Amino acid sequence: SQEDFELIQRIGSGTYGDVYKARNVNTGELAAIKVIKLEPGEDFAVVQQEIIMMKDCKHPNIVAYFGSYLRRDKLWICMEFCGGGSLQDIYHVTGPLSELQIAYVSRETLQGLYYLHSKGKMHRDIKGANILLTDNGHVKLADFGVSAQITATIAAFIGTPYWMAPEVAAVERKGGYNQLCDLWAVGITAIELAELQPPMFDLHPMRALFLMTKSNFQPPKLKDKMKWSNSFHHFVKMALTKNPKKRPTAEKLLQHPFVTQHLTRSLAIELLDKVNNPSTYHDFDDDDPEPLVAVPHR
Amino acid sequence: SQEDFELIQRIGSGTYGDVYKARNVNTGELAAIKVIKLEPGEDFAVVQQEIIMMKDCKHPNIVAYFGSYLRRDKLWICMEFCGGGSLQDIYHVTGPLSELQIAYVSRETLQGLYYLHSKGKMHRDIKGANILLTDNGHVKLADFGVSAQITATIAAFIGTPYWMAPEVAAVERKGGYNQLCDLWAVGITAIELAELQPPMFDLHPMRALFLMTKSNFQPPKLKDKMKWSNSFHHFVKMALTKNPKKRPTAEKLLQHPFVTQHLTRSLAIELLDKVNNPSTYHDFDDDDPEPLVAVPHR
Numbered sequence A, B: 001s002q003e004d005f006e007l008i009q010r011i012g013s014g015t016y017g018d019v020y021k022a023r024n025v026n027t028g029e030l031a032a033i034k035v036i037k038l039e040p041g042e043d044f045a046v047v048q049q050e051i052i053m054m055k056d057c058k059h060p061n062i063v064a065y066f067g068s069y070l071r072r073d074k075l076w077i078c079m080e081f082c083g084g085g086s087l088q089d090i091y092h093v094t095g096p097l098s099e100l101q102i103a104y105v106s107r108e109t110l111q112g113l114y115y116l117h118s119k120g121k122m123h124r125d126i127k128g129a130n131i132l133l134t135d136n137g138h139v140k141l142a143d144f145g146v147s148a149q150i151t152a153t154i155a156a157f158i159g160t161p162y163w164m165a166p167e168v169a170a171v172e173r174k175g176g177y178n179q180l181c182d183l184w185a186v187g188i189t190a191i192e193l194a195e196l197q198p199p200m201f202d203l204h205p206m207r208a209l210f211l212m213t214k215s216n217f218q219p220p221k222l223k224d225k226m227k228w229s230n231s232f233h234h235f236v237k238m239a240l241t242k243n244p245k246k247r248p249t250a251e252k253l254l255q256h257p258f259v260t261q262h263l264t265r266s267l268a269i270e271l272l273d274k275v276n277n278p279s280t281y282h283d284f285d286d287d288d289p290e291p292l293v294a295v296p297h298r
């Protein structure tokens, strides 16, 4: 029941409700609980779908589902607690991530999407706010709300299609995209972790979307042409292929040098320590540990 | 009240409900009545908006509003009766229209849109089914349901815009077009009246809209390159300008030769007679009317 957990503190805000740090009353285990307020009679098929998808995903790079409890218009969704927090929360304190840190995160995210895509699902909201870190440095993906929204909307034109002007047709269209769009978000997220914000972030949301549809649109690059290697640049160049049909899948991009190089969870531990560091030194004593083998000096 | 009219026969189907030929109980005047079934609690702001717009338009090329009556979930909207019927209804019996007939209809439609556009309104569903004819050959535009829908929807992204792939952005966009889209519909309608159906009519609605958004999209032409004049072709070429900013407005297109030439309601009377003709001859007697001036012959 809900009574098995005690909400400790709000740690974020999901697509729907608030996320709270929580503790189990008996086991003492930590967990993250998404509290969602439901209005009577409202379309439940959406939060219902999110739970099902969470319930249907068991992968080391996806936030694991513990349980869900509904009590009087208040729905709790229990999941594993990622101590590090969102990457966005991290690089807001931390500076920009390292290239190797971006590389590690990217490979793990791609591993998560690989799983989702084989299942035939898509995340459709891949960003720094949805990529979490465990205390040991593991990378998990979160927030299946958007995914759930898109699935639920699979169910009416305004006007008649054939008589629509091209600019009206662009707005009257629906669907027509697949899971390869997640790969684009990986490319944008790569930039996001590098430059503390996605490209075009200063524009209005509608204005940014309109620019992407223009025929003369060219995919973003990394501003510092010299700060990052050719692999990182090339990785983003592939991930940010405008044409979806020629865009590399999750497996093809996992075969890329930038993510196929040696990358361990040490890099995330580093990142976590920097967040736990708001100090370049500490007290110490360095002399000869054992007198028995202490080299003499006169 | 509703009791002032008696529904005679269904004459069409609007965006919302059925349209009935109707007669006034007292005056004996004919009228068209749109019967709309409303569910309790439903968004009325849309049919409410349609009435207001109809009520707000007094132009010789727009179907005039007589009244509207609501009685127990059943809303009547009374308007002038166009004896000829829809152009689509006409060319389904009639063959394709003449070039001069298409020209006459086009000028009158443009005159209607000119009025709407000066008021800052848009039709957004200009087609043969919405262009009516009076018994005397006058051309009126109808069906403000779509217009009303678009206005009412002026009031939430799925996912975050900046991380969206271009193909997702295309579907997540909204608005971004103006009344110039009506001019495109005029161009398509010109083809429709000429070839008994719009271009791409054999495609699926979604497929047709997707093709229009492609960068390599080229506006349709008239299939018979030799059946119609250069003016008609050029008229459609202007009206079907892919780029909305360079697309001629309603006034600019009214200055075009194809519609600035001599065109009278005789052409519509012709069209109406052909519909009232499902016969190339009839009984007659041709000899010398008056003997007093009858020229002799021996």
Ligand SMILES: Nc1ncc(-c2cnc(C3CCNCC3)s2)cc1OCc1ccncc1
Pocket (backbone or CB within 6 Å): A011, A012, A013, A014, A015, A019, A032, A034, A063, A079, A080, A081, A082, A083, A084, A085, A086, A089, A132, A142, A143, A144
């Ligand atoms: N499963 C989760 N585990 C931990 C967090 C945390 C978020 N912020 C945290 C702070 C960061 C700063 N240091 C203290 C801890 S931990 C969020 C989680 O999930 C979020 C979520 C969002 C949307 N849908 C589902 C889950």
Ligand SMILES: Nc1ncc(-c2cnc(C3CCNCC3)s2)cc1OCc1ccncc1
Pocket (backbone or CB within 6 Å): B011, B012, B013, B014, B015, B019, B032, B034, B063, B079, B080, B081, B082, B083, B084, B085, B086, B089, B132, B142, B143, B144
């Ligand atoms: N005001 C209207 N006056 C007459 C018709 C007619 C439609 N079909 C007609 C037949 C054609 C064949 N000959 C017999 C008559 S008359 C439709 C009208 O309006 C339609 C409308 C649609 C959608 N929203 C508003 C109005």
